[PDB]
Amino acid sequence: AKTSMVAKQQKKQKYAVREYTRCERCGRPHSVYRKFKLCRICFRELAYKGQIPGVRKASW
Amino acid sequence: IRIRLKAYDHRVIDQSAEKIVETAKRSGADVSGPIPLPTEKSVYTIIRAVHKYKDSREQFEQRTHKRLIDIVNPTPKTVDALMGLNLPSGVDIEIKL
Amino acid sequence: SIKKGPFVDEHLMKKVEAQEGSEKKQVIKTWSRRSTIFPNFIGHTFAVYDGRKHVPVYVTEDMVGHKLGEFAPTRTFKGH
Amino acid sequence: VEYRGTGRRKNSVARVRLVPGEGNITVNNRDVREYLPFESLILDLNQPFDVTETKGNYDVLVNVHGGGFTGQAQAIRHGIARALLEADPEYRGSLKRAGLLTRDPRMKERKKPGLKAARRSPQFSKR
Amino acid sequence: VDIPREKRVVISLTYIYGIGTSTAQKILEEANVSADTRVKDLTDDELGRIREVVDGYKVEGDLRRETNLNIKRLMEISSYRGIRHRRGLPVRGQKTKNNARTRK
Amino acid sequence: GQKINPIGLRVGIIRDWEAKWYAEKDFASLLHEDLKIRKFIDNELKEASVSHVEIERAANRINIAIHTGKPGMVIGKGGSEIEKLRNKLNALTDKKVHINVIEIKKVDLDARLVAENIARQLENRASFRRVQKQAITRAMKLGAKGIKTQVSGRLGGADIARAEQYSEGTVPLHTLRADIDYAHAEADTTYGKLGVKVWIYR
Amino acid sequence: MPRKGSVPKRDVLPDPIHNSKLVTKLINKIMLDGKRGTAQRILYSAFDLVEQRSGRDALEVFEEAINNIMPVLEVKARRVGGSNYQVPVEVRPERRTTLGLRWLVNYARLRGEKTMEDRLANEILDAANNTGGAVKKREDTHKMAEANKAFA
RNA sequence: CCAUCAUUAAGUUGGGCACUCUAAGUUGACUGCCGGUGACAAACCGGAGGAAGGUGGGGAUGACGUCAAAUCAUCAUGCCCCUUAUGAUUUGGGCUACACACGUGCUACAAUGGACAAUACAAAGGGCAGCGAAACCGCGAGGUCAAGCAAAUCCCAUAAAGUUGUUCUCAGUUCGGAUUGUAGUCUGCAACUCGACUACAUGAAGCUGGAAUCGCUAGUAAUCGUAGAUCAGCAUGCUACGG
RNA sequence: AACGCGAAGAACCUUACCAAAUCUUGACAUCCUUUGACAACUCUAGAGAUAGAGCCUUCCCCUUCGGGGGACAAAGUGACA
Secondary structure, three states: HHHOOOOOHHHHOOOOOOOOOOOOOOOOOOOOOOOOOOOHHHHHHOOOOOOOOOOOOOOO | OOOOOOOOOHHHHHHHHOOOOOHOOOOEEEEEEEEOOOEEEOOOOOOOOOOOOOOOEEEOOOEEEOOOOOOOHHHHOOHHOOOOOOOOOOOOOOOOO | OOOOOOOOOOOOOHHHOOOOOOOOOOOOOOOOOOEEOOOOHOOOOEEEOOOOOOOEEEEEOOOOEHHHHOOOOOOOOOOO | OOOOOEEEEOEEEEEOOOOEEEEEEEOOOOOOOOOOOOOOOOOOOHHHHHHHOOOOEEEOEEEEEEOOHHHHHHOOOOOHHHHHHHHHHHHHHHHHHHOOOOOOOOOOOOOOOOOEEEEEEEEEOOO | OOOOOOOOOOOOOOOOOOOOHHHHHHHHHHOOOOOOOOOOOOOHHHHHHHHHOOOOOOOOHHHHHHHHHHHHHHHHHHHHHHHHHHOOOOOOEEEEEOOOOOOO | OOOOOOOHHHHHOOOOOOOOOOOOOOHHHHHHHHHHHHHOOOOOOOOOOOOOOOOOOOOOOOOOOEOOOOOOOOOOOOOOOOOHHHHHHHOOOOOOOOOOOOOOOOOOOHHHHHEEEEEEEEOOOOOHHHHHHHHHHHHHHOOOOEEOEEEEEOOOOOOOOOEEEOOOOOOOOOOOOOOOOOOOOEEOOOOEEEEEEEEOOO | OOOOOOOOOOOOOOOOOOOOOHHHHHHHHHOOHHHHHHHHHHOOOOOOOOOOOOOOOOOHHHHHHHHEEEEEEEEOOOOOOOOOOOOOOOOOOOHHHHHHHOOOOOOOOOOOOOOOHHHHHHHHOOOOOOOOOOOOOOOHHHOOOOOOOOOO
């Protein structure tokens, strides 16, 4: 399922209107943004490591 | 000329635009003062839960910080501010001429 | 998918062009669901596939205005 | 009588002048009698200059800026205020401790986060 | 044909078939219509201009019957656009859960 | 404990950026090339007790900054073990050139320095007191005030996980301009994983 | 926050039309949905039948009309269990001015017309002379805790 | 960004008016302050002092912790499988069906309105070959290509509600507008189930809502909306922002 | 703390559901080795993927040897995906 249909997005899909964007540390198609191609949760952890750019969390 | 200095935080683009507003100040230039442009932020309104729990929504922040510096006297014995590489971390070379 | 070419199917219609040479057959494992009807192939039966098993139903001249998709009952819904 | 003052109200600002002679209203060279339709707070718009008597005394020539046309108002009655405290500070007890030159002390509360909209809680489908 | 009386040409016509939403733009335009042409209208030469326009199509009671045999013809097409008039179903495939309390 | 990550509490308030680059345009492609070289970068260090990383992008100069808390094994002899990561720098992607290295005196003062270490002192499962009692007591003998480190996931061999912390002193762990670093590891024991949440101080 | 007991009362503004705090507090009561320009201007058309049936000016007749709404005995139900709890309350003049105006714009909408171009004009000059409409704020508490004076 | 310059079409042009608003860096409040009855028990109260008055305002780390709360259906992984299928592949159906209980919002039940036309005033935000202005075509949905240029500078868009001359009189009538046929207007290999319009036709409920139950203590309830994300194609779902 | 919930756009996909179609070292991530080193595009029949077929039968330079650091996976076996 996931590892087979991640090559469907990483290579040319039969129907590329499907947009089956998975991730590498998550098998996630349903929390992926345009500039991320990654789930909101593992990006949140490596927002606390400095691979995604500088994004603050609390104190508003 | 429109040397817009741009980064994520201001405190990196402060000293980065303070690199170009100072090294061209000692040059033969007529630098416009530091007049930063309106700086857009971005709310990434994710939901704070994992699968079910609504009324759990987390906002995020990422900023761009545009500035406005323009000098009006180009001469090759002075312009080491602009051609000489200094601080390319956040500073993409927005050297319009 | 535009009204440039007000949509006839042309792979039902091409496969009906691939049928209207010789005599047309009554039940094939075909779909005929997203395909519209015009009255030059009437009389012939087509197995519209509802989803479980394909079941045949014939094309009349009174089927002009619409598609062949409302033919095969899909559900056996009956319920209450 | 030439005094420069400013004032803001609800995502909308202003800046004024002053001119001697009598008192007039020149908000972007038109009036605030067809601008502001309800004709209500304009009656109490003189009460900023009623404690100073510069209503039919000091012409303003306002240049207003931004936001709603209602937010265009209440930035010019704070616009007159700082220009009046350099023109006539004779009534500054009835201008600073009463009325004119104070602040914008409250504005529109935000669409409150962590909730639906401005402290409205999302409608519970439970008991 | 059997329009109600004591109302305007934008207020009396809009009931019988072939006038509805239609005296806003369609029946208003093709007739010499005023704002308040009531039952007192001299409807022998004022109707005389608009009796040429009131008879134009099947909508004198029978366009409903034209659609009725086409409701039958769509049932002879055997489509869901007449099946849900015949089976209680909202005809544009709409919500046949609880919040459909007029058509069952 | 139903709380949030404390390392998130000071992103940009007290701390600085470990991502201080600028990639605005065409962010999608040249991000996947960062994490295509990243998934082997940690496995080649062989539990080096790395602190963290600070990636930098500047006119396609994507420079790698890995710490590798134990030194020597990344240098080699004057550029023998450093060229091998530089050879893979030209092998995975086009350039990626000029890998570096650092070291750390006071070897258990950082957060992830301990966290990668005291995870690796839990596969053997031998003296979870005394190795941490060597760690924490010497840490205040190395200049610390309140250090809080736990042993969480299924100690002893048991089928139930038992957390075992050690903490004392003054510990303002929630103030805005305090630099707090916090970690997590995945030392499994073939029945459950050791997610270790470390805290140290100065 | 009422469990601390007393909260400070909210204050009023006098309109420059009448220089009366209650004239604008009559404006602050008629604002259904808080409609400022749409209801005050139409209440300004809805004293035209108020002053048609009363030649006296509004600033005198509005303190005449509410003077037959301001009571001396109202009822605050005290915790006494199985009693009528009809405790006579001599009103403080804050709430006595407030309660005299509360039932006014509650009652314009159950008459023959239902247009607030003249619903507020219908309601006021029927409720001036202690007879009907808004006097049931005042005159009904004078027939509530009185036939049963045994439950003070 | 136009007081004062005129060639104001405000090319808001010459100069750059740019003085002020106007877009980014810094500090101003602190019962610091005076009188107390308040006696020292520190305060608090009373005022006026600052722009702010008593943290001026909002949040945030929610404490050591509780409910094994949900999810091995985003991931993992301790287990078993599973290995002609618990892997599948395509498109056919369906995920939206139907006697339906609860929910949830939308919108009516007008004449504090409707509607005709007017006049506004907007903020925030979007944009990378796109906004679609505008010449434009059609009463309409929506379409024929060019402009510009990556933008304090280019398009959305005049937002309306306010009010202003009028028709209805409170009513299901002109209030708005469900349910259905006609237009194929549209993007899309492909619009019956199972997309959208407004224009033709149908033109309904509908009388402000019992008992219950909800929030709301001011820019709040309520109200008119405007754009932005998910997105071929689709919001009464979501975030902001004006009034 | 379930109720315009997870779902922030269901003609295909989505679909996780089922039925046909024709297949089990698999649409996949690809290890090793035969390295057969690319049917890397299209006609016909079939819902359509799928079945009969002609195909950019090779590519980055040098110690001088046609051999690969990079080369399609036509086979595969131990597997397992």
